[PDB]
Structure 1
Amino acid sequence: MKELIYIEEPSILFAHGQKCTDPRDGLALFGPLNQIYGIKSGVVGTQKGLQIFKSYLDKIQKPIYNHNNITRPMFPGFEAVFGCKWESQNIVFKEITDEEIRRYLFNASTHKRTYDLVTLFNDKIITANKNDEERVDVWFVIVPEEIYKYCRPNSVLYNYDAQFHDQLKARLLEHTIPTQILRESTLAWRDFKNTFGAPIRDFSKIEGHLAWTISTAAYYKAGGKPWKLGDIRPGVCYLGLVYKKIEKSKNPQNACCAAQMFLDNGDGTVFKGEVGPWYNPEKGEYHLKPKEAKALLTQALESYKEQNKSYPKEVFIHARTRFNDEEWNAFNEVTPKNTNLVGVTITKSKPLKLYKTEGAFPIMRGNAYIVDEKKAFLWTLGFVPKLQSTLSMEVPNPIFIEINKGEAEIQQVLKDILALTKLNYNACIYADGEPVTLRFANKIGEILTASTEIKTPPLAFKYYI
């Protein structure tokens, strides 16, 4: 009885000023907008890690294909898709001895085991970056199977997180060093054998997709922008607010809100929030004290001024929970009178499974549902005709947007969200369920709330994923 209005797929800008829907296929067609001249890879690990990383990179030099590449497109080779060169030569390596590994591993406490391993890795990165006459732009540490399976918190035979890469990145924030974490099981599925025999990380049919993801992550961390967005109106900032909960022992952790800002470029000019003991989790509705609200808004405004040399005529605010009215009263007292405030709440737990009456494929991605002029249902999950398969399993679930306060066209915020949800960098996929500013929200909150020693972190995005 009621229609499902569809929103067209926004095309991402590519090389030579052209646009295509799929990032993989079009990136194989055109390439990156601004080519880099190449980067040096610093692998930190063992000799086995050395040989397996060199073998994997030599494997991804030559073109490799997936099982069917309508869904997971081809990988023509790193030089054949990015332009910048990558070879096994001129690769810097740092020795990780078993003696330190064994001396650390023989301790029973797993948390201090994580502590000493991250301390060793950070110290070796520091002594590789502070005295070596050579230059490394990207680091690729390798964790073997035994370290990953023995550092689990609940494996049975306080100021830091139990997991590795979160606090590695958190302690590596201050020195402005980009790096990537690679599991041994990820790139060595050939010899990674379980009890049965099959690879646990069975990347055999999608080694092209694995090469796609790794190469895109490396080119992102290199410094060259892989892609940008197609259509952006002048004077809009997508401020996706984070409210990742922090559990630093028994001190008042409360709220540690953060944000990612999209003004005119794909990268998120992320500014750290406060440690922030206010708003006792009895009132754990994750609102904002006015002074931090104007602090964050002024931070975004001066970021827009320093990166665009003008004033933003419109503000987008994204979150998961609802918004109050006093925080917006504090917001509007500092905004210019020509601005516009929009607060959109994104939820997933709402149960709504539009089953298909007849056919062989479910509801596609992009078919939105309008309830009111302020709230709507958007399907960023499911079938897409370009990839010719769904991105979900069983039946996908949509996202429910809701403009809390502020007047706006629901179609405008729908198109803005659909344009935002196609910039996943660490994973090379056509689209995801949640938007990118919310997909990266958990990562940025985890990184910025893992080490309290960080005060003013680097506001470029390359040091996080």
Structure 2
Amino acid sequence: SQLAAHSTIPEPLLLFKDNRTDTHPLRGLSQYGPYSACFNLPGQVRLAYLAPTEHMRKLDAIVRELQNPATPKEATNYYVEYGGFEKVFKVPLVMPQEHLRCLALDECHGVAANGNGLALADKIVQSMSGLFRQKHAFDVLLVYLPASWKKCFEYDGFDLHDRIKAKVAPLNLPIQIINDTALTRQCRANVMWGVSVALYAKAGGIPWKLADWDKDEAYIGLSYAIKKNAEGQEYTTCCSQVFDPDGTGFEFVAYDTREFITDRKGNPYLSYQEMQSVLSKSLHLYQSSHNGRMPRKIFIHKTTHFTEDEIQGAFDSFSSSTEIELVQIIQSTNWYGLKVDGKKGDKPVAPASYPVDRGLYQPLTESECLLWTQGSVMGVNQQNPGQPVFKEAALTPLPNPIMLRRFSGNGGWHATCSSILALTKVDWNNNTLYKKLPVTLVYSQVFADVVKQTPEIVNEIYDYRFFM
């Protein structure tokens, strides 16, 4: 009844302005500043509005709240005080002029009443037509979707967010959609932090990045989306890649895995040729971003298991000098764990008040491991300095671990666990401490949904700034 000895991965360190490190992202931003502030890119964040006549006051109010300090009201153990956009991000947040604020057409209300989501997306993109000639006058555009259109937000086979994002993707126009959720949430500091980070990222800046990150390693994620029609179902199975270039920066791209259009698949698993094509595209991207050098070691993360054809294609896609590690992430597992503390003077061995630490990994078999991406983190609490913080306390009594299955690789579990934990903290769209899954899987899933909605935006590589 004794398992193998477990080890705990130290909490990943985030890099900020002047190459300073901090575990807490919001605290690091507040005390040191964004990573891209030293590069003066962006020098300013200019905004644009796209809302009906009756709801531009809401956009003005949210921008004014962004420009002014706010204090946390919920989850005070983690969230720090928001000191405004200029104080935190060191760049001004320029309000739009009269020509940079656009009006939604009156036909949008009638289209929404008729329930035609595609017509609503077309009307929104046609409304935003005037800003195409003035793209140089602003950085990020704000979209407000009133609650009166809620019937056209998400029904069978449609996603207004995904459709609008796919339509604005080839126009090189970053957008940020604001609903009534952001305006009627009690904790204003949380919304302010999330929106400010998203706006700074979409403007072209890097809020933070991992501190001790190897430039000779590349990370690839594959996730699938299912679209069902009368004939049957089809799988999107998009891809994503994470790496930093030789110079200062951070690369986050996603691309479709279909070698040619009109290719239909009924299963998430890819073939030999498809895997070879996708990994050749990834290798070409890495070589372009690293002065023509090959990665010393390659990480591929998948939601489903690796078939023999997939493994063979992966091993034949890269050279012999590149190490290949195939890991399958299983989110749902039957295992859960309890933290037990040791003897501390007079107090005997008793269960801990707070759950198992985030970063503990338990080797189960020669090919499977239990990684705890959810758990208690020390050093991030604001109220009690010495008290652990459990992010999912209002949702889960206890954290639920994830399982990693090894299909190829001779290295230890330490490198894989460190990589996954480090990648779970670079979601700029996420305003909390960490994500349960690595950001590669999240971005691949998001791009899979977007491609599923509109299949005409495939065969072009897209940055994370256009889909977060």
Q: Cα distance 1:86–1:32, how it changes in 2: closer, same or farther (>3 A)?
A: same
Contact 1:241 1:318 in 2 (8 A): yes
**Aligned match for 1:61, one of 67, 74, 82:** 67
Q: Deviations over 1:147-186 (max 9, x none)?
A: 12565538xxxxxx42210111112222221111110332
Q: Deviations over 1:117-137 (max 9, x none)?
A: 1001111223321x3486222
Q: In the alignment, what sits opposite 1:139?
A: 141
How much does 1:32 deviate? 1.1
**Aligned match for 1:47, one of 53, 59, 75:** 53
Q: In the alignment, what sits opposite 2:360?
A: 367
Q: 1:105-124 counterparts in 2 under 5 A?
A: 105-107=112-114, 110=115, 113-124=116-127
Q: In the alignment, what sits opposite 1:73?
A: 80
Aligned equivalents of 1:412 and 1:360: distance in 2? 30
Q: 1:273-422 counterparts in 2 under 5 A?
A: 273-274=257-258, 281=266, 284=267, 286-309=268-291, 310-356=293-339, 358-385=351-378, 386-387=380-381, 388-392=388-392, 393-422=396-425
Q: In the alignment, what sits opposite 2:209?
A: 228
Q: In the alignment, what sits opposite 2:194?
A: 213
Q: Which piece of structure 1 moves more, 174-183 or 358-367? A: 358-367
What SS is found at the alignment partner of 2:252? coil
Contact 1:366 1:380 in 2 (8 A): yes
Contact 2:218 2:241 in 1 (8 A): yes
**Aligned match for 1:31, one of 30, 33, 42:** 33
What SS is found at the alignment partner of 1:368? strand
Aligned equivalents of 2:104 and 2:84: distance in 1? 30
Q: TM-score, normalised by structure 2?
A: 0.87
Query: What fraction of aligned residue pairs are identical, expressed as a percent?
Result: 22
Contact 1:12 1:227 in 2 (8 A): yes
The aligned amino acid for 2:130 is T
Aligned equivalents of 2:265 and 2:451: distance in 1? 20
What SS is found at the alignment partner of 2:462? coil
Whichever structure has more strand as a proportion of its residues is: 2
The aligned amino acid for 1:464 is F
Aligned equivalents of 1:151 and 1:174: distance in 2? 22
Q: TM-score, normalised by structure 1?
A: 0.87
What SS is found at the alignment partner of 2:446? helix
Contact 1:144 1:185 in 2 (8 A): no
Pairs aligned (count): 434
Q: Which piece of structure 1 moves more, 398-407 or 22-31? A: 398-407
Q: Deviations over 1:54-88 (max 9, x none)?
A: 11221222211103643112111111100111143
**Aligned match for 1:174, one of 170, 177, 180:** 170
**Aligned match for 2:427, one of 424, 429, 432:** 424
Contact 1:229 1:266 in 2 (8 A): no
How much does 1:277 deviate? 6.8
Q: 1:68-107 counterparts in 2 under 5 A?
A: 69-90=76-97, 92-97=100-105, 99-107=106-114
How much does 1:291 deviate? 1.4
**Aligned match for 1:459, one of 446, 457, 462:** 462
What SS is found at the alignment partner of 2:202? helix
How much does 1:246 deviate? 2.9
Contact 1:253 1:277 in 2 (8 A): no
Contact 2:13 2:23 in 1 (8 A): yes
Aligned equivalents of 2:112 and 2:214: distance in 1? 55
Stretches of structure 2 that go unaligned for 5 or more consecutive residues are 341-350, 382-387
Stretches of structure 1 that go unaligned for 5 or more consecutive residues are 155-160, 190-202
Aligned equivalents of 1:89 and 1:255: distance in 2? 41
Q: Cα distance 1:150–1:234, how it changes in 2: closer, same or farther (>3 A)?
A: closer
Q: In the alignment, what sits opposite 1:194?
A: none
How much does 1:353 deviate? 2.2
Aligned equivalents of 2:325 and 2:212: distance in 1? 19
Q: Which piece of structure 1 moves more, 297-306 or 40-49? A: 40-49
What SS is found at the alignment partner of 2:214? coil
* CA RMSD between the two structures: 2.2
How much does 1:373 deviate? 3.9
